[PDB]
Point group: C5
Chain length 205, copies 5
């Protein structure tokens, strides 16, 4: 089994429009933002222009294949796989994906998609130029799937919150924390899980 | 009918170019804007840059299926369904859809599409920085279908007009009301229904 | 015959790349701009940012269908029909079509396409802030078809020149007139008809 | 052989990805810019924002057909024909094609494509506000095909250099000249022909 | 076989989604940036707006043919070939490809793709207006493929670092050097090679 045979199968059998749900069991999607840069801040308008890696992970067993005597991983175009319909609730602009829209698929059906995104948000900027700085919270979760179909969860809290952050940034990061939530909206019957990421940063002293 | 079978049928049988009309009966489309944010205001030019959820709903019985022994709802791509050719009459820019273009389809043929849109409009801004504030009216309705084919109607007046509004917005909402209309234009023979939404807001005093 | 059957036929038999010409007879296309708004003016640079309805009409008999028992009209996507390759000669930016790109087709082969366009032009702005105001002329005609294939003609001079104009516009319209032309260019052998629309407006006083 | 039949053949037999080369003989492509307007100039940054007609012409005999009793020319979409991969070497932005992307095809296989393009360039602006003015040179030629496959050549020097120029332009044209070249680059083995157009203009006085 | 037969084969047999890997052997991709221009600099924000040729080269033997009596090179659209999923790690905007997205393929399976790109970056701008100037480093490597699949390497150090640079640029180039790297990220298990290009330039005097 070669990469050609592997990609060819996934391409020929995959269905991007169908969520890899197993029974009433929701699809476990883990989200993790890794800030790469903070470009524009406006404390007057409370708007931020930031860059980050939307490190996403989930499992699709219909993509699994035996790799004992074959490659364990392959790069698959996002368009040939089903992908979480995630959305940043307080995004003020659409995502400007800066990187190739390819995902990584492991023979066991594990999918890893980590695109670099530049996007504007509406959040609390007050305190940016302070020692305690500002705390901009960004909430992102499925747009059409509720908790019974899709569930989002945070990840790796170890990793230095700014090991990927640009050093030439006009700003600096104090701390980053992610706490998942589960909300029921008057608009909508069922509950919608989402990961809230709090970006505590400040202008470089 | 697993989710794959459901989506597969809709995809294979649907016709996005055909309005789900039953007899001389128009398609009942309900529109409801939920303001999420007001980004830029210019009282001199009377131009607004706002974000909102264009909560739309209508019914397409050709999408209905028996859900007695399967899911009741599925997420369908907008491109696989017929969608109302709505247009904001005083929109100054085209809609910047910020969210995944997926709709939600209920087994009974009910369709719910609620994209988050950022868009500019030409309306009355005078009074923005006033206690009574300004009242910006936005009218949206079908562009090519008259009242006999498509009819638009407002919805849920209860819901707090700003329960989804951003708190970090430079502005605040006093009140929001929607009143449907029915106009005949010299340009055009038949009548064209539309929902007029009045946004009474003001700068934070 | 119901809309599905109608749209289905047009879709299956139409050819967007073929001009509906009958013999050496040109296709009679009528153009009519209805100004909706004037957004930015610069008398120094003679540039205008305006919004208007490019009300276009022509006839394609290959789309005609018997309707003694069926609607005589349907909404057809622009991509499934042949459309006039019109261009605004003094357009400084490309057309930002603000509305659904659907056309209206009458059972007799009559086609009506009226998109709302925002676009910048290079024209005479001098006099904008004057009682007599400025006169910005915009010329639009087929880009590749000469008078023997396509002929453009103005229309309805009655209709109040500003019955669709925005009232919140920083400017106001004095008068609008359209006079068709027929030019032969040294560059090009045959003659190219075009409609010249003169927009006499001024800053509201 | 009406037009539908003509377009239908070209569409069904054409191959946009294949250069109409005859033997080791290159394809003779003639390029000719006709300036329509000069919109923004910055002598400090040496950047120009200009509009022009990229009048292009070449020959593709596989498109030829018997015009004995059938139309001689037809309008063909650019996407159904092979087109020169021209590029403006000092273009600072990509081409904003302002007109329908249709080409004109003559029964003998002659192809004429003249789109109106707005684009920014990096060139010599110094002297713009002078009697002798500035001379902005723009070089454009095939990006991937060398002299043995594609050869570019200038054209009609008669035509008044500003018979299509906008009169409301903040600037004026003194003279326009085009001189073809043939360069071999260290980067690249073979030689690459290109047409250099010198735009001598100045701010009006 | 003619140009047509060659392109036709590549088109009919190629697979853009499959990396041309031979055994556990990685694909050797060589990257080389040739700066064409530096458009905007901001020492305060450490952001650069630059234009360059992302001269890329690699080998895909499945594209090789017998040119022993046929043309040896052809221009192939990027969409019909597999292409390295390269990404500029500190790119602040996505690539604005200014040129035709065509690659050059040699009968031996060698592929050469050199698009002209305008793009913004986050790097060290301090010193721009200095004799020693600033050194802006840009790192680019595969986004999804590690060193075992894709390996990147610099190239030709001879070529005058500014023989393609614009002379009208507000800035000038002192020196350009490229040194490949190999990094293992806590985020990611395997190692990811990348080419680091250091642009030492300064404002003119
Ligand atoms: Ca194989
Ligand atoms: Ca942390
Ligand atoms: Ca099943
Ligand atoms: Ca209310
Ligand atoms: Ca009139
Ligand atoms: Ca000349
Ligand atoms: Ca052949
Ligand atoms: Ca060097």
């Amino acid at each position: 089994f070669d990469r050609a045979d592997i990609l060819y199968n996934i391409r020929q059998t995959s269905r991007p429009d169908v969520i890899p749900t197993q029974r009433d069991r929701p699809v476990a999607v883990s989200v993790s933002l890794k800030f790469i840069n903070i470009l524009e801040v406006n404390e007057i308008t409370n708007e931020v222009d930031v860059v980050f890696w939307q490190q996403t992970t989930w499992s699709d067993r219909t993509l699994a294949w035996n790799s004992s005597h074959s490659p364990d991983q392959v790069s698959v175009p996002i368009s040939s796989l089903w992908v979480p319909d995630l959305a940043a609730y307080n995004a003020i602009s659409k995502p400007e994906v800066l990187t190739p829209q390819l995902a990584r698929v492991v023979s066991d059906g594990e999918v890893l998609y980590m695109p670099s995104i530049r996007q504007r948000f509406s959040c609390d900027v007050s305190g940016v130029d302070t020692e305690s700085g500002a705390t901009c919270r960004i909430k992102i979760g499925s747009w059409t799937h509720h908790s019974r179909e899709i569930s989002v969860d945070p990840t790796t809290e170890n990793s230095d919150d700014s090991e990927y952050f640009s050093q030439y940034s006009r700003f600096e990061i104090l701390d980053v924390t992610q706490k998942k939530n589960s909300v029921t909206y008057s608009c909508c019957p069922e509950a919608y899980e989402d990961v809230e990421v709090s970006l505590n940063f400040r202008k470089k002293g």
